[PDB]
């Protein structure tokens, strides 16, 4: 089951070969060919056109590139979104495979990917045809990329209390929670307090330990509650002022009482 | 240039077999609620070996099986220290006792140990050969993102590659990490002077277990 490509190297490249026969110059791993299964891995003006068995025989011409833009190595930040170009096109179908599976066949230079993950690392491979005065071969370039961790450039963002007020019948309990967004950093040392505005003095209430709300690759959010067993008459004349900090900055939000 | 991260270790000592110990790591520069903290071994000569992890957000605490049931890991939030007591050395035990940090936030996926203590000591790999300036692949067969460490003969091993291929900050652009299938392999590009040691590779999980490498002399 014949199929034929070529590879163009430029500065720092890779090649695969699938066994792209029904799965469920070789058969004999002789050169610094890696085979791990169902896929041999080629580091670099030869050719290599093998076979492995519905059998599967490749053919392929390696030949040096010269005219000659997103390289061979990709760096996807996770957590976030990114996009991995097609070196080889700097648009006609291209399909993508992430370490031999399957992705897009999308008409465009360039897989998006929207929630990156630790498993979007690897390489990925995009094939498109081409034709010629008349023959089709098919182009193959190898990208390697890596989910590489970094901290982010963002203050910490107060989800609730969004309201300046909070209307409260006095006697009766109260709980304000706070609840904020951090972003990521690889020594994460979160800060969320709750203080109180008395006359002209500010001091950090004294309960209780926070706790996660929410934690993936983009958000971790801490919620952390102040609670007063009975708003009293005093209760309207302070705010209770929510404080977040992180590493590059801190936010706050203060909740002033009003009765009704 | 923000308070950065220490890891005291103390408490070692020779102890006779059947008796105990109580180890302790003074950690300096982060919050145990957002890290996972490390217990991991070198007997004399060998390699590294994990010994126990614990997780103080939730409370979880886990153990490598050559040791379950011995010892118990536990950690005081207030002290920011966290202890490794040992109970009924086998004599195997014999070994520097390493405490070393990873993050354990967000997501909580796997970016390797980060920081190292030097190691407290308790009484009770390979080789590749080559030289400066040559290509040198390392391969490592056995789910997890693995991590590559550079240990120098006698110093707490230091992180080159976290999630497979992402490279360590400081770590040299020389360094490459891959996955393919079951085998990952570690590149030093060009070798220099400084690049020889001894080099472990290491795999997390299923749930928690961190298993490392036998160990490569470069």
């Known amino acids: 089951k014949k199929l034929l490509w070529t590879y163009s190297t430029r500065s720092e490249e890779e090649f695969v070969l699938f066994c792209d026969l029904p799965e469920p110059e070789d058969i004999k791993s002789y050169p610094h060919i890696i085979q791990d299964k169902c896929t041999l891995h080629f580091l670099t003006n030869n050719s290599g056109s093998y076979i492995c068995r519905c059998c599967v025989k490749m053919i392929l011409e390696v030949k040096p590139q010269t005219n000659a833009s997103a390289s061979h190595k990709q760096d996807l930040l996770l957590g976030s979104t990114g996009s991995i170009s097609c070196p080889s096109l700097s648009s006609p179908a291209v399909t993508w495979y992430k370490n031999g599976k399957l992705l897009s066949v999308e008409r465009s230079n360039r897989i998006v990917v929207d929630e990156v993950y630790d498993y979007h690392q690897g390489t990925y491979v995009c094939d498109y045809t081409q034709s010629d005065t008349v023959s089709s071969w098919t182009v193959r370039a190898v990208v390697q990329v890596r989910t590489i961790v970094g901290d982010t450039k963002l203050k910490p963002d107060i989800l609730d209390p969004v309201e300046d007020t909070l209307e409260v019948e006095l006697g009766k309990p109260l709980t304000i929670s706070c609840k904020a967004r951090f972003g990521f950093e690889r020594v994460f040392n979160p800060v969320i307090k709750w203080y109180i505005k008395d006359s002209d003095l500010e001091w950090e209430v004294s309960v209780p330990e926070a706790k996660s709300i929410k934690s993936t690759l983009k958000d971790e959010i801490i919620e952390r509650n102040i609670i007063l067993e009975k708003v009293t008459q005093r209760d309207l004349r302070r705010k209770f002022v929510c404080f977040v900090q992180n590493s590059i900055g801190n936010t706050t939000q203060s909740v002033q009482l009003k009765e009704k | 240039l923000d308070p950065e991260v220490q890891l005291v270790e103390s408490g070692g000592g020779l102890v006779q077999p059947g008796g105990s110990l109580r180890l302790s790591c003074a950690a300096s520069?982060?919050?145990?609620?957002?890290?996972?903290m490390h217990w991991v071994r070198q007997a004399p000569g060998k390699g590294l070996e994990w010994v126990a992890s614990?997780?103080?957000?939730?409370?979880?605490?886990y153990y490598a099986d050559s040791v379950k049931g011995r010892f118990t890991i536990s950690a005081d939030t207030s002290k920011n220290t966290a202890y490794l007591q040992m109970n009924s050395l086998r004599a195997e035990d014999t070994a520097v006792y390493y405490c070393?940090?990873?993050?354990?936030?967000?997501?909580?996926?796997?970016?390797?140990?980060?920081?190292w203590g030097q190691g407290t000591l308790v009484t009770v790999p390979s080789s590749l050969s080559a030289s400066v300036g040559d290509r040198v692949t390392i391969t490592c067969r056995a789910?997890?993102?693995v991590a590559w460490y550079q240990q120098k003969p006698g110093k707490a091993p230091k992180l080159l590659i976290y999630?497979?291929?992402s490279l360590y900050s400081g770590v040299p652009s020389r360094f490459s990490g891959s996955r393919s299938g079951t085998d990952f392999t570690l590149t030093i590009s060009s070798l220099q002077p400084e690049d020889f040691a001894t080099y472990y590779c290491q795999q997390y999980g299923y749930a928690g277990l961190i298993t490392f490498g036998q160990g490569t002399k470069v």
């Open positions: 520069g982060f919050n145990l609620y957002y890290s996972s």
């Open positions: 999630s497979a291929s």
């Open positions: 070393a940090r990873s993050s354990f936030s967000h997501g909580y996926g796997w970016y390797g140990l980060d920081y």
């Open positions: 789910s997890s993102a």
């Open positions: 614990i997780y103080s957000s939730y409370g979880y605490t």
